Amino acid sequence: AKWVYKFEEGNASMRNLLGGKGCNLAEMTILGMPIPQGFTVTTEACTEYYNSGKQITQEIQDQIFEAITWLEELNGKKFGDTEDPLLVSVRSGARASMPGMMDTILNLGLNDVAVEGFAKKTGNPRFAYDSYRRFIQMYSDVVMEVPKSHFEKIIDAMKEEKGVHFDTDLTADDLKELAEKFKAVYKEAMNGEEFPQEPKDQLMGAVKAVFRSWDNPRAIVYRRMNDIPGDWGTAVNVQTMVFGNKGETSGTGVAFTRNPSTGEKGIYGEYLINAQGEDVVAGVRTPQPITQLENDMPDCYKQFMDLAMKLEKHFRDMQDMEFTIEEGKLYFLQTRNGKRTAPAALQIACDLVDEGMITEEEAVVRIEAKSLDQLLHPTFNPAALKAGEVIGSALPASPGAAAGKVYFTADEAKAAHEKGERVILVRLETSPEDIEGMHAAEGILTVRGGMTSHAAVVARGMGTCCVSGCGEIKINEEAKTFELGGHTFAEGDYISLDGSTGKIYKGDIETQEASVSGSFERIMVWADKFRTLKVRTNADTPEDTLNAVKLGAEGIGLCRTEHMFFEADRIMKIRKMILSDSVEAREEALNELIPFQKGDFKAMYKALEGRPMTVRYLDPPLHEFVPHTEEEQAELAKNMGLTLAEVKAKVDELHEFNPMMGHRGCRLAVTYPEIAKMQTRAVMEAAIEVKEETGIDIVPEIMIPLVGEKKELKFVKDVVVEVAEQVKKEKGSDMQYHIGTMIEIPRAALTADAIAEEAEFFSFGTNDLTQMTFGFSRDDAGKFLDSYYKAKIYESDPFARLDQTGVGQLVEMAVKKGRQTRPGLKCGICGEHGGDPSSVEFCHKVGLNYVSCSPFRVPIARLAAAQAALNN
Amino acid sequence: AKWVYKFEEGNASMRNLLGGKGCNLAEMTILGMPIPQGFTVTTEACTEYYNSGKQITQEIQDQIFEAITWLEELNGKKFGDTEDPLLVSVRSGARASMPGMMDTILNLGLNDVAVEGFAKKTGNPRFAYDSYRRFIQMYSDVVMEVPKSHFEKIIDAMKEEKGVHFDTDLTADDLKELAEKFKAVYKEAMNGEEFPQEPKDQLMGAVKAVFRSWDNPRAIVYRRMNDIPGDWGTAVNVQTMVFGNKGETSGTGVAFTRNPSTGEKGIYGEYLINAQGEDVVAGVRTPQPITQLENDMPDCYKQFMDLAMKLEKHFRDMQDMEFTIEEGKLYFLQTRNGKRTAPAALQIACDLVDEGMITEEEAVVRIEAKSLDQLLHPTFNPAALKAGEVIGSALPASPGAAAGKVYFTADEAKAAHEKGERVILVRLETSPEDIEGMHAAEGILTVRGGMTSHAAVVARGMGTCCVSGCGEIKINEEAKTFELGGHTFAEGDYISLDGSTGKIYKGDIETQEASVSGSFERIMVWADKFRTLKVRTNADTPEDTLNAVKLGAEGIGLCRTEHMFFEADRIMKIRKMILSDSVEAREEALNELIPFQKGDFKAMYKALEGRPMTVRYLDPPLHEFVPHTEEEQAELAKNMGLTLAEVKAKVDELHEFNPMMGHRGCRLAVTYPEIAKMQTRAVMEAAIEVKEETGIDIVPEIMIPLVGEKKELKFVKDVVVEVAEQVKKEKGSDMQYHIGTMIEIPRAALTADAIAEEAEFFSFGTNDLTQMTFGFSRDDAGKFLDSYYKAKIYESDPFARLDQTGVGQLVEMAVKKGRQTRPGLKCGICGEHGGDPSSVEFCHKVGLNYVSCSPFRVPIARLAAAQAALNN
């Protein structure tokens, strides 16, 4: 059946068939707009391809060519024809937006003859070859593997030798020449083979390699970053060209109907006099401000002006738009919802709602939950900024205060950042090839490329400062240095940028905390209103507490209690207990902890103010609390009066093949019910008084880690209660208090109906359940983990994102089961997953009471709650 | 309800309710044997009791005393009266036969007063008073907690002060003496509270206790061994007492209806005049052969014999019977299927099946499959035994070559077997309390006790050797020595024990392999004829295939690949490989093993003779295939151009916190597919060659470990399928092969449906699965497991008995979801749960094509796969 569609034959509501591109392309057409005519091979073909074993069925290929013919007819020219040839572009696009990640080829169907036809038919040879070097360039770079630098340097070395600065300055001589060299590049790079002369070769060649784009390395990166199933595929758009390389009254631009950094109303973008779209999107040549095209083409801009506010309305959201003017005749190639900063993200929403185009529901919904992390990135200290040593100033591509140490590629910057380093990456061009870098880096500095460049839209997206098109940079790539201002910067040296001023700095500038702005707060009342999951916070100190509470969090979900045991005033008391041979001896020494931890629990409860807290009883194994240093073993052995060969014997004894799975947690509490009881008293006595002290009521939750058998937790909770019951009788407190569990071990989940006979609550630590379920531990894992992403085996970080398909089955089962035995059972999530919005939604969906996250993630959790509800 | 049944009110089928010892007194009473009329309070009382916060209800209490009144009427004696009292036995016997794991009290209904009325009645004060110190004893111990260490000394402090060598020798006044001191002993520990003289209060206090028995520490251990469920509890019996301790015409005993060790046919059992059963039973005295009762009183002999033969006949099973002569009269007290050894248990069945009394089927179902482990126990080297310095000798109460270092208490013995010693237990007596020892002991040596004893029997069932009743020995528990014939021995001294002669040996006698009787071989036939499961083995070498094979093993279910690097001529290569700077350096270093490994398979392929083999690829992390010593480290560097700095650089890096959850197994081939190829080559080449030579058909199974994702196994599998077809092209081979996957990560059995699409078989490596379903290690589970069993947290050992409840869930789910996409899907299990009968059944029942257990456990799988085929 139909593998090929015509723009007119389609609409925005046909996105899964033709992409966001051909579905807005079609849409733009059906809007009557000046959109160059073409067709789309649907994402079904892409699929057929991989199952046609990276090939095109005789059927799907005839439809392509059959459709091409159709374009000829309409245009009045034949494909890659000899004299008056039809010229096409071969564009990609997935179901979703992944700016500059996949590839596109331009001017497809110029052979060795047609360029002469072309030259003569347009009476413009400068133009013909520019478009032909451009074909061999793009085509060979993408269809084959021949990299840009080659073409980038050749097109370089030649303007040098020729003593020219701009592309617009090469003669048709140099371009025909360059044409020759570009095919030399090709014929070379591929042991003999010469550049495909038949457009039916060119055409099929592109379509295929654009399907292939789907799995570019960089594409697999953007997809993980944004939870995109690597299986969707991409459609290939075949669109009849419109040429901007045709002179002064011709040229190419891209724009956002509103600011994508600031959020501000009114056009934003760039344009490039006499140029094809690539140079601009592809961060290859630095273009000028859009105000130019306004000034020096007051008409084509007024037209563009209208059509932009059309599309804004038609789509009811701020749009990024690709366009070309060919000889004073403006053309719209693309439109989409611009990827923006979170600060921007929010401003627009409030705006559109305020104006009246979108509701308060549509707002909360569209916002990319994760970008909220940006809103708490530290900004510069004014005085420090005002004293930093300016060395230069380029484009404010992406906002942010980025102080770091320079690397000249991505893989390195990433590694430097994955060491502990704060990295600033420095690059010739603004590229989506460097996405591994841009993400790693605190900041990005480039010599060329504009804010409209792909990378930029995407950098504004992730939350990476950018400063682009700094043509005053020299990059010394053998030396691994670069020159700007007066100096030369060595790899590792501190530069600092400001994606807001644009001004660049030698050195490393101070950063203070950041302010949370208005619209943020407006947005925050809506989610808060539409959501039904409560947002907790993983937090172990009153201070961590105040921070989350300030952001707008409702309780502590996980409050870990291992630091109460670690600290100088602490670590002795516990160390004593471990070396105690008598049980009373162990009791006795832990006891000397009680005034300490109770004073902790009071400091917390004070900060807490009646919000719930799930306190986490002692997690890890004793050997985490013993001295592995002989210095502190001998000291210890005197502190009590033993031979160092007993304390050394104890550790040795407590030591473990696998720490992840020792006599730890609930298995510990069992053999040493004493620690259980001790923490019971502190919590209770701290709770009771701080209620008696503040008047605000408290209902302690007590959480037991690493359970997996009902009878196990049974034994343990029986202890706690007694202690809670006595502390009560003593004090004479009627105080409600809950005892529940961590569901972190599968069997705990698998038997959730047994466990629930005991657990008053369930707390899901998928951090730990994901280790157990997967079989790898967080740490040692990294060893394969990246080799996995690049290979498409895990399309998400199981420790960063709750693996619903597997780990998730357990999460649900433990709910469906736990609640069957106890229907009014509360459940929470508290991992790192507790703040990933995929995890957050899913948790709203399998029936959670709450999610808990890091203080500074509470708002990702709150908006991610807002949307989990509305979307169901 | 009817919480109480007269003996006449019951039968065989009321076993779960009357308990075992219930349905037997009922059964036997109906057949009308000389059973002393008593009555049975039901096992449901046990439950009601427990449930009732461990108290007795009014109705139960009422139901008891009412029969106590019926009990009087027949006896013509008002219970525990003063002039002519009614004296009862309060006995315990669960629905399961846990010999002497349970308490029972003799002679309840006696006190200072009633004792006197008895001696006036019975006109025999030495007896009258003996039985009041007995009841005083057996009560103080069971209901309270006073130890036999005490009582058994004041008794000896009397047989020394009164200068007698026997208990018989003691005048009624020593007993008037021995009696009170006992009460002195009792009160001492009861806070100034004395013995109860309440024929009523004594009863309730006694019952309560007998119900409490079910959770007896020995019991619990015994319930962990024979898989008895921990919720069944115990029924309780109050029976009229007859008297073996009256005179020279009275006496007690017990006798098997066949040799319970060697299965020999005919009567076997001992006897003791002038004592109540407990003497023989508790292994507190040494009895004489029943040959004795044959000369003394041959009517009672001949009475007894007949009923033993009628008893076997009625139960179609070698009975274990208890009798007590009260003055020329005989009285049957007890009966049960006679716990035997694996030897005997095969014997009888074949005999019973011959004779014409049990079906071929039956023969199978009722052989404790797990016992066949004794079967392969090594036999004392005959030449080395002909040398053996025999020092003394006694009752061969249980068979076997027991050899190892001696300890004086159960725990000293067990704690020695933890470290890994081969221990021999040395005891005053054979007692059912010394169990942790009987389990960990290679055999046991007691000064006093019979072959018809409690512990004795439990020794035989376990397959544990026991030489009992060696009057010679003198234990010096202080110094921890014993003086026997030759010399005095020290805690740890090596000796051996021929349990088949009860001949002792000074020294650690050399041992050797053992064979299997034609009786085993006969049963093995009846196994296969009846089982649905196939059975393979965990085998790495031709020696161990050949071994497995001949035991019944069909093919191999799990061949490990590790030694192929472990080994001498192998390790340099993987060591050469790890340190390889290039993939090229790898492949190079790698291909050098192919020759080594290739034969290592051609080897196994002439050994399987067509039997299928499951080949696990490499599993561990590289840090295992390196020198973990710093001397070790440098020596390899000198051999490959490097230095300590370069070696440690690796050996350091290769380090993981938890290597169980490490970059290992399937995750290795992801980043180093060079091995997968290498391994695929070593196998594929060897297969055909051998297939082509012998002319036997060979179809390789290949199994990838630590798979938890579908895409994950295909990548490794794709690597495999290329090398495989590359060899097949080379050799012009059509050799089909199968690529399956272990299932040992929980995320695989979860997503079974996805996995089976790529994997041609599931193989259940139950062991890491357990370790991960439980969230803990086995190498590390010593430190709490003990608590857990003792505390009843865990009933069974999760690393030996397949956990049907939790882990079993994933298994089913795996075979379900798995077979939903590959109907033909073969799945087998290779754990240590592949030689556990209980585990095997669940496997049978769910649909595992086969089971695979270690070569020396194949006869257990066989029988068990046979039993479970039937019993389902």
Ligand SMILES: Nc1ncnc2c1ncn2[C@@H]1O[C@H](COP(=O)(O)OP(=O)(O)NP(=O)(O)O)[C@@H](O)[C@H]1O
């Ligand atoms: N038929 C065409 N005629 C003239 N210019 C075109 C044509 N098709 C695409 N372009 C331009 O060439 C550049 C590349 O096309 P495009 O398919 O949008 O890829 P991209 O913009 O680089 N990445 P993305 O926008 O996310 O798909 C853009 O500037 C387009 O506007």
Ligand SMILES: Nc1ncnc2c1ncn2[C@@H]1O[C@H](COP(=O)(O)OP(=O)(O)NP(=O)(O)O)[C@@H](O)[C@H]1O
């Ligand atoms: N009413 C009785 N009269 C005489 N002897 C009795 C009586 N009741 C029990 N006995 C004997 O006392 C001894 C112990 O009692 P018993 O209830 O059988 O526990 P056990 O044999 O020691 N262990 P178990 O076999 O598991 O129940 C046995 O030797 C009995 O034969």
